[PDB]
Symmetry: C2
Subunit: 513 residues, 2 copies
């Protein structure tokens, strides 16, 4: 060590002890290259692929060429507050795709951004615009209910029923209700998410992300989420019912005036991933989808469908939600839309709910830039080409890779519990090894580092790049490009059988450095 | 009347301001649109990505480097592997900071995708520090309590009962714990300046003063207190108002007393060296020294936001170094993407930096190889030839400011001030809400004056200016360092024309 270090020291220390301390110098297709002791390029097969950003692989020639052309044409990258038709054009296409895949003829407005978290946060913000609109309306009614009950109570007709007063003379009861209601109005809203949810790591979005050491230090900053148990959905109704909050009004009935509770909108939005990355690639079950629908219908807030990972074809359709029958009101996309080379994202918000203020009170310096716009159109061209046969490829490559994984599970069920996911978004679940015979394995599994250690084995002994997913690296992710070959899938089967035979043997010398 | 899938409202509005144009190509300080007949009309760009284009649109050196990086098969997505370029970029910014401040401090770098993301990394790390302070204080309080309980039970001391307005032993102990836990879970506060603009995401928007942008989202996130930058002698009392204390038991031989102890409510202080949302006002020495006192006093970090002021714009790399602001965290963005890609960075002082952050924060796109490579190029360019790029910025800045000042001197009836430094300048417009012209008065009342004037400049002089400040009350001028004397002259002509029409209250001509 010794010498000054200006970034990544801790991160690199850790990567090294996991066996993952390598620098990749070049990438193409499903292959990334590092330099060995002697200085030649060793090819490594990439199953992580930007955590699912690279449906078309690293540095796809068609995307590279288009990008260089865009650069040579003098594309206007920074043209803020001018007419940028390409944003309308991208949205037209995603709209047409959504209609095709859902049957539904709904229209969405598009707001662009620079990352998944930014796009989800545009959704969070627009959700909260809708709640403020509901809130204003209810408080307007309450005012008129009060004025009415006061004129009945003063002029003569009615008498205040005093048994209602545990909830708080006229003016004093009125002002106490306004005091109560204003306190309630200013309380932060709640967001609903699923357990294992991963929606981004910014100040707002991190609260929507379950992972405990990532989120808990920041609890005090921003509105919280309630993390619904996705596997036991019959439980979700009661948990949301617990969260009801009411405000107060005065209610006239001829001659009796009563203080009464009225429902207050606490919940700003519900968020769901069609396939749940922080949970180990579990797809949302039909039962769960129908509970989310009920919740959205019931509370009158938007269902936000987060397709940062599941979208642009990964699941065997453009939208994973369409595949799995999830009918959201807002949608977000990112990752693969930058083509593997630039940074872009988008929030699609239904036009019958969309509030025009948002188009001019939200904005960003880099958002909607011409270059990533141009690259977005190219990606959508590619994924849609030839009668939508790119999706068919994804399906059949996905089937092939899942069958291999399922075949590996069947012979190694002692260390592998499940295969999860769909299309080319798959994972193996590892059985717990916190109770393991090998000292060195047990200690890593106890630290939540098992998956990373196994990944290091796969790197150094088989030249395959896998990365773990899930809360204690308890899952191994497999999300390669659509061009993944049978030979590469066979090489991965060989590698995995090797890995899980060593893990069966509890061979800690060999697994842990 | 046909289906529309984005930008309908935005485009409606741009059109009525006179700003409804499509640019098809850009190079240097010039953007091009197509006229009725289909030829490229050149427009001089004074907005330049709101200050992102210190080197202009699509600078050949940046374009070429980018295409090379693409041809080389650069690894863009290499998450959780060894990416030396991030350490390299940080080494350089470190060396630059030492050079320009004299200070030999070391900063850790965390990268991101926008200015708001970078500022929010800072927000998050500020709050990690406060949780550490909080844990420590509550640890002491525990031991103060155990001690005061053993004195009170084992003879020596008696509880002085006059202290009890603040809440028998166990009952007083548990009431203190109840009080303290309530206080521990309250959201922190952030301090900013009036007119502050720090980003528009859920967290960052609360740090942004602009009222219609922020107020709808109040309920979501911790608030800021917006300090009055022009009247700093007032800032001490406003922060004092915000003190909150916790309770402990304090032993003095024989008397045990309940007493207050200071609680850290403030997570960070944020400042822009030159304040974009305020119309390009630079932080005065007096204000800087008040921010220093505040940071020393509260023990939270001073976060210096150089998203706009950095990468040379002010005539040094760091605007804070120019203006004598000594922050603990720094953030950069905008010009570091070279005008073509999206990147940002948080520099956090290593003696304050908490190692957990390096592994509990992360982002998909952050630290990508491509914007990394382009970052090194930009830093190479801005540092080249003995740091003469900065000297250029100074001298171009002087020239453009003198023109603006000269325009002010003959048009002081409609122009109050010139603000800013280096190539980050603005004219302040006098209020026109009281204006003679109907059509002008109505736009000024809507907060749209600056946009209307901008439309005049576009259609009658082929110059692109955009307003700044809360009611478009300022006109921004922030072009590349390559801006020419001829272009500056053409802008002087255009401005004299504009402010002569505005003097004339010529609403027919100004408002479409
Ligand atoms: C499903 C999902 N949603 C949101 C995000 C956040 O996206 P980004 O990293 O671009 O901010 C991610 C990235 N992990 C994601 O995988
Ligand atoms: C000083 C400052 N800080 C933060 C931001 C936000 O940066 P971005 O738009 O890339 O999120 C801006 C851009 N208005 C800025 O000028």
């Amino acid at each position: 060590s010794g010498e000054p270090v200006y970034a990544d020291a801790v991160l690199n220390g850790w990567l090294t002890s996991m066996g993952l301390g390598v620098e990749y110098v070049r990438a193409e297709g499903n292959t990334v290259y590092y330099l060995d002791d002697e200085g030649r390029e060793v090819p490594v097969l990439d199953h992580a692929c930007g955590f699912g950003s690279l449906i078309f692989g690293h540095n796809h020639p068609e995307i590279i060429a288009h990008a260089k052309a865009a650069l040579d044409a003098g594309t206007v990258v920074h043209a803020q507050l001018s007419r940028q038709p390409r944003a309308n054009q991208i949205s037209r296409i995603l709209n047409d795709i959504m209609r095709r895949e859902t049957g539904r003829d709904d229209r969405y407005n598009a707001i662009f951004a620079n990352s998944g978290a930014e796009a989800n946060e545009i959704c969070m913000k627009h959700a909260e615009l809708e709640r403020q609109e509901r809130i204003t309306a209810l408080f307007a009614e309450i005012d008129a209910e009060l004025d009415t009950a006061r004129e009945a109570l003063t002029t003569g007709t009615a008498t205040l029923d005093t048994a209602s007063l545990p909830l708080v003379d006229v003016d004093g009861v009125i002002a106490d209700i306004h005091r109560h209601n204003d306190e309630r109005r200013a309380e932060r809203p709640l967001f609903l998410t699923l357990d294992g949810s991963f929606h981004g790591k910014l100040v707002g979005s991190i609260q929507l992300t379950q992972n405990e050491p990532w989120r808990t230090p920041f609890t005090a900053l921003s509105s919280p989420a309630r993390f619904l148990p996705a596997d036991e959905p019959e439980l979700i109704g009661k948990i949301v019912e617990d969260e009801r909050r009411s405000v107060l009004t005065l209610s006239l009935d001829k001659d009796t005036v009563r203080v009464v509770e009225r429902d207050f909108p606490v919940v700003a939005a519900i968020f769901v991933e069609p396939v749940r990355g922080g949970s180990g690639m579990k797809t949302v079950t039909p039962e769960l989808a129908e509970e989310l629908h009920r919740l959205r219908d019931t509370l009158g807030c938007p269902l936000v469908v987060d397709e940062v990972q599941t979208g642009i074809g990964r699941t065997g359709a453009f939208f994973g939600s369409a595949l799995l029958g999830i009918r959201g009101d807002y949608y977000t996309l990112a990752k693969a839309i930058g083509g593997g080379i630039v940074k872009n994202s988008v929030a699609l918000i239904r036009q019958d709910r969309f509030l025009p203020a948002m188009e001019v009170i939200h904005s960003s310096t880099f958002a909607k830039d011409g270059l990533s716009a141009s690259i977005a159109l190219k990606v959508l061209e590619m994924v849609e080409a030839d009668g939508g046969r790119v999706y068919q490829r994804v399906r059949e490559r996905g089937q092939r890779l899942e069958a291999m994984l399922e075949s590996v599970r069947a012979d190694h069920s002692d260390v592998v519990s499940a295969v999860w996911g769909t299309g080319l978004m798959l994972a193996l679940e590892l059985r717990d090894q916190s109770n393991a015979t090998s000292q060195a394995i047990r200690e890593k599994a106890a630290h939540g580092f098992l998956g990373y250690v196994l990944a290091g084995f796969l790197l150094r002994e088989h030249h395959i790049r896998v990365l773990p997913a899930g809360p204690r690296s308890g899952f191994l992710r497999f999300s390669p490009s659509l061009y993944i070959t049978d030979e590469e899938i066979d090489r991965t089967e060989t590698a995995l059988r090797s890995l899980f035979t060593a893990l069966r043997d509890q061979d800690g010398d060999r697994l842990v450095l």
